[PDB]
Write a structure and sequence with these properties.
The complex is a heterotetramer, with 2 copies of chain A and 2 copies of chain B. Chain A is mostly helical. Chain A has 3 helices and no strands. The longest helix of chain A has 18 residues. Chain A is elongated. Chain B is mainly α. Classes of the chains: A mainly alpha, B mainly alpha. Chains B, C: It is found in: Cell membrane; Basolateral cell membrane; Endoplasmic reticulum membrane; Postsynaptic density. Chains B, C: This is Disks large homolog 1.
Chain lengths: 56, 60, 60, 56
């Protein structure tokens, strides 16, 4: 629950464009999500997410 | 980011639905990861905190 | 602080027990708050965060 | 849960000495707790405690 917080975000991050490849979602939308995942503070959100969720 | 997160995890949800079922099953699992972790009860918790709680990480 | 929080909330627990039953029932309720909030499953988690997560407050 | 996290701490913080008055807890122990309650970071744990607990 702490690995995917970055692994999932980073893995899906690189897949985003691959998705557009076989989905035709929206290159523009893809970029938006890249930022949604690129956010440094975000990595802190998922890190703390499992940190508290796991300690509890 | 709260609105960007829901729009991100929401987009990913639709993406996985139209992603897998071809040759990206595992990748599908990746998307749902971001979906659950995003919409998670705890996730929305730290995001709300960020409103005025700059988490200055230093070792983690 | 974790050791001080437990020893604090622990002391308070014993204090309330020996506090009320005289003329400070309401005060007992106050001590109790500090105890529950202290030993709270969530509170302790946050205390751990302090390890390396300088939470800067702006709306304090 | 957000109020007492700080409000409650202040109640016991003020009555602490009153407690020693009618408990004999010893001002020494009271002083230690005053510090345990005087800390600023604590209010962060308290305020955050209610934030997530009241976030749902």
């Amino acid at each position: 629950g702490l690995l995917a917080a970055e692994r999932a975000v980073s893995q899906v991050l690189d897949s985003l464009e691959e998705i557009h490849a076989l989905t035709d979602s929206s290159e523009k939308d893809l970029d938006f999500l890249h930022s949604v995942f690129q956010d440094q503070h975000l990595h802190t959100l998922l890190d703390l997410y499992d940190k508290i969720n796991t300690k509890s | 980011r709260k609105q960007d997160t829901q729009r991100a995890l929401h987009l990913l949800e639709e993406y996985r639905s139209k992603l897998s079922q071809t040759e990206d099953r595992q990748l599908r699992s990746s998307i749902e990861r971001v979906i659950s972790i995003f919409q998670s009860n705890l996730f929305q918790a730290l995001i709300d905190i960020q409103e005025f709680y700059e988490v200055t990480l230093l070792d983690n």
